[PDB]
Amino acid sequence: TPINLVRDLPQGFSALEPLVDLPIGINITRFQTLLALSSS
Amino acid sequence: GVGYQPYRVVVLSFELLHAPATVCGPKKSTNLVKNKCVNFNFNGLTGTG
Numbered sequence: 860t861p862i863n864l865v866r867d868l869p870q871g872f873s874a875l876e877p878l879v880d881l882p883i884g885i886n887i888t889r890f891q892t893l894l895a896l897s898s899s
Numbered sequence: 900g901v902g903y904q905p906y907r908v909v910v911l912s913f914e915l916l917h918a919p920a921t922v923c924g925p926k927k928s929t930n931l932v933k934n935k936c937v938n939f940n941f942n943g944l945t946g947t948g
């Protein structure tokens with residue numbers, strides 16, 4: 860969904876289409892994201 | 900002689916109740932017809948029309 864404001868979530872409506880569909884079958888109770896990105 | 904030669908044996912062992920079914924045999928298909936009352940079956944969606 861392209862937008863016009865880099866600030867907080869905008870006002871509008873847009874539905875999400877299905878993308879991937881998998882028969883994993885597995886047991887889930889916790890999820891984590893991945894980030895690709897010294898301290899001074 | 901027979902009974903002494905080497906033999907290639909393969910075991911087709913399968914299990915259940917481990918994951919949703921994802922291995923199924925080939926499913927045949929027939930030709931498509933139009934303008935005639937027929938019994939159709941689209942991906943298991945059975946019906947007459």
Ligand SMILES: *[C@@H]1O[C@H](CO)[C@@H](O)[C@H](O)[C@H]1NC(C)=O
Nearest residue numbers: 884885886887888916917918
């Ligand atoms: C996790 O899903 C599994 C099957 O893979 C099920 O046996 C189990 O009840 C779930 N885990 C817990 C702690 O209940």
